[PDB]
Amino acid sequence: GNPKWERTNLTYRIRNYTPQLSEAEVERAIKDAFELWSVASPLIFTRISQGEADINIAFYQRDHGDNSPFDGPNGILAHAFQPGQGIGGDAHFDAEETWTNTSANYNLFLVAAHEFGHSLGLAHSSDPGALMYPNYAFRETSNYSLPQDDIDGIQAIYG
Ligand SMILES: Cc1ccc(-c2ccc(CCC(=O)N[C@@H](CCC(=O)O)C(N)=O)cc2)s1
Ligand SMILES: [Ca+2]
Ligand SMILES: [Ca+2]
Ligand SMILES: [Zn+2]
Ligand SMILES: [Zn+2]
DSSP: OOOOOSOSEEEEEEOOOOTTSOHHHHHHHHHHHHHHHHTTSSOEEEEOSSSOOSEEEEEEOSOOSSSOOOOSSSSOOEEEOOSSSTTTTOEEEETTSOOBSSSSSOBHHHHHHHHHHHHTTOOOOSOTTSTTSSSOOOOOOTTOOOOHHHHHHHHHHHO
């Protein structure tokens, strides 16, 4: 339905952490993941440590109150809701995963980056090179930039 945010400065909050990474590694992964979309659009992402952000980020297991349960290790890594009020925009990560910042399954930055596409209103692409491809695979992250198909997608929505 072409659901999109109607402001360019959006806020986010990290509500909890996974045990497999320092808080600063989680924080860094989320920040970089938002930055990939920011360098390609008018969107500006601002962190809050509490209170009511546009995008809540959380790690949960199995049933977690939104009627799309997670499934234990592998399979669904994360999900995220389309722009909108309330749960709109929020991104949940399967606490049962191995979460890394290395080439080993699963790179938290890469999964967040994909999820935030969904959070900003993108659907999946059929382009096997795109971030918004429906399946995960690791790609070099040390200066990962948005693939051109995903630049096209975010620009199509937000300029
Ligand atoms: C370098 C990359 C290119 C593409 C990457 C990617 C692709 C897909 C994911 C999520 C993979 C995932 O968890 N998919 C749920 C649906 C939720 C959703 O679509 O977000 C399922 N299996 O049903 C994470 C990362 S990483
Ligand atoms: Ca899972
Ligand atoms: Ca929200
Ligand atoms: Zn959820
Ligand atoms: Zn997806």
